[PDB]
Every structure is written in structure tokens, then in C-alpha cells.
């Protein structure tokens, strides 16, 4: 389970404090509004910014808490959610839709 290469537009789950492996994609502050720009970190280790789902979010995470979300791991959590939080099951649901960055809508 050594580091993960994450690419632009790669669907992965991106574990937070007290949250469990949201299903969060790897973007770039090119599609990350001024919502998302605002909260980038300026702490010491590269951060990457993924769109979080649903609702297309924005999140500044190290690749350290960032995993590899693959298609089939995301619809097996749509079978099964865990825990049990609308937003996260509205996540894999609406990122299970969403193949790539290049998928997701910009408010440009």
C-alpha cells in the first residue's frame, strides 16, 4: 500500500478527521473556485486538491490519507454504504457517475 501517483480527474477516497475515505478526485486549483483556492493549505508537504462528492467540493489532502477509489469499490459501497451518512452514500453515488475530472462541471 506504498504511496499512491494521483492524477487529475482520478477518482480516489480521501479520509478525513473523525470522517471516513470520502470518494474524492484529484484536481487542481485550475477547476477549484475561490471557495476551494481559500482553503488551501500552506503547510510543510505537497497538498492535493481533489473535488469531494457530492456537490463537487474541493479538499486540500496529503497523498498520505489520499487511496486509489476504483469504479468497482465505488459501486460496491453503493450496494453497501458505510458508516451510514446520506452525504457520503450522495458521494459515491454521484462520483460513481462522475468517470473523470474533465466529467465534472465548473462554475466557469
Known sequence: SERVNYKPG?????????FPWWPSMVVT???????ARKSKPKRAGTFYP???FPNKEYL????????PLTS???SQFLEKPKPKTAS?????????????????????
Open 60 to 67: 486540500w489532502t496529503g497523498s498520505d490519507s489520499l487511496t
Open 72 to 74: 468497482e469499490a465505488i
Open 50 to 52: 481533489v473535488i469531494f
Open 88 to 108: 457520503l452514500i450522495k458521494a459515491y453515488k454521484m462520483a460513481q457517475s462522475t468517470p473523470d475530472l474533465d466529467s465534472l462541471s465548473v462554475p466557469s
Open 10 to 18: 482520478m477518482r480516489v477516497l480521501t479520509k478525513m478527521s473523525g
Open 29 to 35: 486549483e485550475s477547476k477549484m473556485t475561490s471557495v
